[PDB]
């Protein structure tokens, strides 16, 4: 059924994520020494423009280690292209603490007896309130071009729309603000060049009754998250749209 | 969740209809919900087919609809089976389109054809099991391309010019068959598709490598061939070193151009559902691998 | 209830009979509480007895000729050899049908409670044992719904005033008591609940009520009626005129001695309150909306429909809102303004 | 908002060829009803210079200036005149805003910095945005030029408005990383807002002058010569009179045939009569009714309404087919026994338009449609209503009715059905006037309609403000 | 008091105990030995067993019958919480923005919402826009539909079971398949109402094109932007197509009634939503067959309510009238039986 | 569609029939589906093919 | 789902050792019959001196992919990987892998030890490389196609020299030119001219179709499109049509888009999860 692999990370990254059901994302460092570093979804928020100031402050206070600070420095310092430096690996289910910790991720999983996915409130959205019987979930990276800092958006959403093209048809409505700013940057700055606005990655299928809200506590700094109580994973590719 | 779907009929069934059902085994039928148990009214495309709302609307509804294969049908129990990704299945084609080995299959609303019958099969008084067409990639993307070209051209034109334009455009021949688009209508769906196409074409005009605009003309100065004669003939209706060259700029510009092209491309491409590797010598059925 | 049911087609002559000579004609099934009520209430007429029931299911099996007919024609004729033999012999009457020839000669005794209804004997059953501790619903615990309708803010005519209760209740002469604007009902419990126009406000304010467009569409689609009585109601012509000479051209209008036709609203006014709703009122077909009036008119020598809004409540016809009702409503307004004893 | 900016960009792009500068217009409940704004399909404009020549017709004079001679075969020039008039009409970009608003507050709420001299708020229940162009053949613009405006609805109906340059430009010509043009457009804003009226003083519409409009910088020249405006006035007089001279031609024909027949009028519509009715009163009522029709005839009289479909491109081919079908000898037996079934002859029923006048009270009706059929037992005409009901106004003694046939034959009728018959003489006017003043709109494809011609009309688009805005 | 009176109409559902009678050997039940199918996996093996039951009816006419002898509960609150017309038509807005906002303030409603695209409605069989209440001691809400009536409407119409639209439309009276006669009976105002021989007791509801017709006839509601998930008590009295379809011969009408005309309302959510998948039982509804609504204890003043509650058993059925204050009595002695089971 | 001539020809069994309403009333109201009804001797059952 | 393949040629001990040393490599076969001949095994059946690299990519897209792990007697055992299962795969390209990456299949651009030659037929396997490397290689080859048409001026040769060498993690690859004897092979020329004509035709058509769309619901996107189009026209310029002609241009643009679809959409074939000094081999989940 499920397929797993064993991964190694520094202790600083594990401090916030210890509960199993977190996503595992592998970032591509520009430097060749820490060429690949495994960051969790929570680490994306502190550089995400859709999070709240309170949660951003909490995440800033959580991470202290030089590895985590260097991960943030790499995430900010690159040429604004995030998804070109990221590959996702699914969901995690193991606890193995240590100075160099081991965590196991399910690249393809449907666990037979609780396995869940953890998404924070700031990162979570849904197009339709009409909860369909079966819901797919997606990861969207949003690229605004209003300023030189190139503020990115990092979203995880659940939707009953099965066909990707209709999903883009509906996504281009709200993210039309991306398209306008993209064209504005294309005219205003002749020199720097963009690739796209948004990227869609599909991983999962779960029922609407599995969508619960839950709290998380490590370092005592409380976080509110959405919990997909029986989520199964199926990794897709990073697929670009404008 | 469900590997089995049970459909049941409210009507009493005749043995002729039971024979037709047991003949239609291994065919493809669409389902709106992907659910355990459905009534027979919400099976097929007769539910959605209002010809006033043209082909684009029905295509948009059908591409969101889920698909299933037919199975152990008996007296008032259909038992449809939803195929999962990657397994090898036997599927029976129902349209007149010829299937040949190695082609990828796509789902589209049925088109018109020569024998003019349309065969009002399985009429349960009013309900009538209209079944979609499963089409290989070239013809299906031809339908999509011709519809998009139809919408792009037809705007701001009189019906007289459009008459000849649609009389040439609506008719498609593929492997010496003769099909025609049932209902070309300019809905908001096609209008948004054209909005995307226009934005994509503008972007590819903007960010494209400066030399790729003039590569055709440099080659025309270099060469003279039937392909290039036609290429020049297209551009003719509006008719040395580069002072700088930097590989990084070209790499970034072509990456952006590929992003824009892939944005424009899938306005025509249909997500393949089946890939064939078998054919009955009577073209009546094929063995396929499912794509999701 | 027992007499209402007709007798079945077949009879298994020995099945379900009771010792001391009784034949069962029916069986009743109901929830355990209903059955208990029946047991207690009808004590004398019930009896607990032992009855004979078949021990095993009756087996029906196919003949090879039936199998071949099923293969060739997708059909089965049970007891096929009986039909063949009776056709060859020439007797049009069979001894027994194919169904009743199965399930006999295997009776066994079980004990159940029975009652007598006239000349009939009927079994009583309570299936609590089947569904207890189970998560499935008892089909005898069905749901049935009823529809209730009641008015609020209705007006009894003052000229026909009458009371059947004066020794029971008395009310203060305050106008709010005279003109009702509320209604009082009972909850799911025996407690009083109050409904007002204020609660209705969430429905009254929605635009669909104030949109006469569908009403005008259906009113135009029907067209003017062809009945001869309707022809006099139809003939009204409305024509605009410039105001430049209106101050002095008054005698010219009256100079010609020709009549001026009535209009639908003015004809609607002249009906009594209760006479308004009767079939003798020809103007009812135009009364599709309270807030908007309808009429047929002549335009470009063709008959067309017209819709205008009733700006004020006064435009309501006399049969729908009478003068006394308006005066009592003004009295209610005075009561709100503390003006019932006016200056 | 977006239509004005886009139109500025588009006119800037094409000014090299067309040499039209853009003029931004906003219209309100004074020009069109809320229903007409809610159901508007196309907005069109046409420029007429001071010589009375449309932009799209040959400068030195054209063959359309020649008269037309009443024949249905070459029906007012055929399809080529329709194609020319199609070519002369140009289409603009427009938007509809159905919710009540005031332009000052709406533009301040937008990114545009309005800078009008005084903050007088102008309120309107609904706004339709459009921008029209007016052509200067060279860098010189003339104040005697006139611009036409048309609003087109899905039923094919349209209304015409025309106003001249000197009202549009009464004071405007006397007032004389990388930046995106949208940014400076919004930051420069607008400051002057004026009311313009149609020549007949029937429509009020507002014009907006954005300081960052591209037409500013061309240092174009403007002047209005007096003789030039006199020419514009007399050309406008020539344009406006088409229907009235047609009505006068009908009048003179009626009187001429009434003189020719010695006043003896034979019956043409079937109605019972009496020998002992006083007919002198009927004759005098006919005189009064005729005078009243002469007075109250309008642009929507039956003769113009019947002339209008004759100008459509289908008329010429239909006239050819009908004449060829009439131009037949007796059918040979071979074609009767073998081959296709016979061509269907003209129907036993016809569609007509009529003007009805009343003497008892001052009242006429002009755009009246009536169906005509011949009574078999007497061979006379019977007038039926559009629903099939019989028209009783023939019996009514106070009524005289003028009928016009599709082939431009007209019957004048007094009580009893005794009639005066003659043909319409459209000889009096040039083809240009008939073809310009009246012509049916021909649809061009847009959103929400079938590409296949002749298919059933889908739901009318109906951009509306009573619903939540659709996306 | 505004210049019009209102008539409310609501549906209340009861959970009941049924008593059924069947004769000896009514139906012959045919059975086979079960067929077993298997799903095989490394973790566990699961067996599916299936017995095919077939029933053959051996009764010529009717050999089984039911009676609803006993009840003990009301699933709905039997309240007067008025139905939210803004929720069922979320598309519609007032043309001026500020007046629309002021009306949103005046009512207890929220900003308008767009009804979803067809694909959303096909993947998700409904909107379910009204969220659940904070708490529910009283059960499912009874949403009262209000049909506008003239102030002078004859009160005697409300004292007996009748049709709330103002004209009887019971198809058991008309001859079958005569659609012209049925339409004349239900809509024509040039002939008397079949029940009370007035032309109509509500000209704003009884004829085609009325306000209540467009509000509650699903033919007109589909023209508007409306939500199909919300149940409507008026729909059974206003859907002309269903009423005409129910005009049949006696026994086919009976079959339609007990099998296919029945309602289905969800039992999980506190507002009455229509069901789809049959996980909720079909609900019997005599009011559809009779095409009439019943009267409920209703009073304009608390004086008559006190004097009727204070009296003995059976005083609830009587109807009393004052100089303008009135009370209508319940046709069914239900308000005391519901105490009696308690 | 039911073969009525077969029912007329093939040997039937006798029963004490019991319809709640009148037999002709139930036939006119069509309590049942697919009813053959004729008066007199209709010879259709004789032609067998 | 297994396939057996028989050699018409004569095997030998060291020949069999060379054959088996690719224990779990991937071999593409044209169509999946139960029994096939060795000629179908590999890319050798497609290559010639006139075609060029582009076609092998497009033909690899439609050619069935298959994993090999055995050497029987005179026949070879093949296995078709199925979706959702995990398999053991070999590293055959010049790259080194890392856990979690996605893999793409490419024609081999560099090479001898793989050469199982029998009668001048060679077992030429494709390349397994991660998706970024595949994208980079295809983009650089397509770019170097453009620089071939001039190729004379010194800076163009310097640029071509720079494109030829690509650096990836712990390796550098000497990518060859797509042109030989200063001629550009035919599919390379065809795709290059199709892409260039797509851009050129869009540049012309965008103005007319932005105007035609503007008569519909005018919005900010069309305004910015028009502004960019005027900007493009101003920069380029300083250097009533018949319906059938317009439809010809549109259909030509769309079909020229179709011919380029093969190279833009780089498809994934495997995803890796194993880290090894044993780097020769890795375990992968199958996609397709």
Numbering used by the authors:
A (entry chain T): 44 to 156, 162 to 290
B (entry chain U): 4 to 242, 254 to 306
C (entry chain K): 246 to 588
D (entry chain G): 1 to 176, 298 to 592
E (entry chain K): 1029 to 1370
F (entry chain H): 1 to 49
G (entry chain V): 6 to 116, 121 to 248, 258 to 306
Task: Show sentences the authors wrote.
Composed of a diverse array of proteins, the tegument is an amorphous aggregate sandwiched between herpesviruses’ icosahedral capsid and outer envelope. While tegument proteins in general are well-differentiated to carry out highly host-specific viral functions, tegument proteins related to the capsid vertex-specific component (CVSC) have in recent years been identified as key players mediating critical functions universal to all herpesviruses. These include in HCMV the CVSC proteins pUL77 [pUL25 in herpes simplex virus 1 (HSV-1)] and pUL48 (HSV-1 pUL36; also called large tegument protein), as well as pUL48’s non–CVSC-binding partner, pUL47 (HSV-1 pUL37; also called inner tegument protein). We resolve atomic structures of portal vertex-associated tegument (PVAT) and identify multiple configurations of PVAT arising from layered reorganization of pUL77, pUL48 (large tegument protein), and pUL47 (inner tegument protein) assemblies. Analyses show that pUL77 seals the last-packaged viral genome end through electrostatic interactions, pUL77 and pUL48 harbor a head–linker–capsid-binding motif conducive to PVAT reconfiguration, and pUL47/48 dimers form 45-nm-long filaments extending from the portal vertex.
The remaining portal vertex reconstruction was generated from NIEP 3D classes containing a population of VC2/NC2-like PVATs that, much to our surprise, were inverted 180° vis-à-vis VC2/NC2 PVAT. NC2-inv portal vertices similarly contain CVSCs with a full complement of pUL77 and pUL48 but otherwise exhibit different PVAT head occupancies and configuration. Most apparently, NC2-inv contains a VC2-like pUL48/77 decamer that is flipped 180° relative to pUL48/77 decamer in VC2. Gaussian-filtered NC2-inv maps further reveal (i) very weak densities identifiable as pUL47 bound to pUL48 in the inverted decamer and (ii) the presence of a weak layer of density nested above the inverted decamer identifiable as a pentamer of pUL47/48 dimers. The second copy of pUL77 head domain is invisible in our NC2-inv reconstruction. Intriguingly, the inverted pUL48/77 decamer in NC2-inv is much higher in resolution than in VC2. This enabled characterization of extensive interactions between pUL77 and pUL48-l, facilitated by pUL48-l’s linker and CPD, and confirmed that the polarity of pUL77 pentamer is indeed inverted—namely, pUL77 pentamer’s positively charged DNA-interacting funnel faces away from the portal channel. However, whereas VC2 decamer lacks extensive contact with its underlying capsid (VC2 decamer is spatially localized only by portal cap binding of the genome terminus and flexible linker–CBDs anchored to the capsid), the inverted nature of NC2-inv’s decamer allows each pUL48-l copy to wedge within a valley-like topology between each asymmetric unit’s P hexon tower and adjacent CVSC helix bundle. We speculate that this interlocking of pUL48-l with underlying capsid contributes to NC2-inv decamer stability and thus the improved resolution of features we observe.
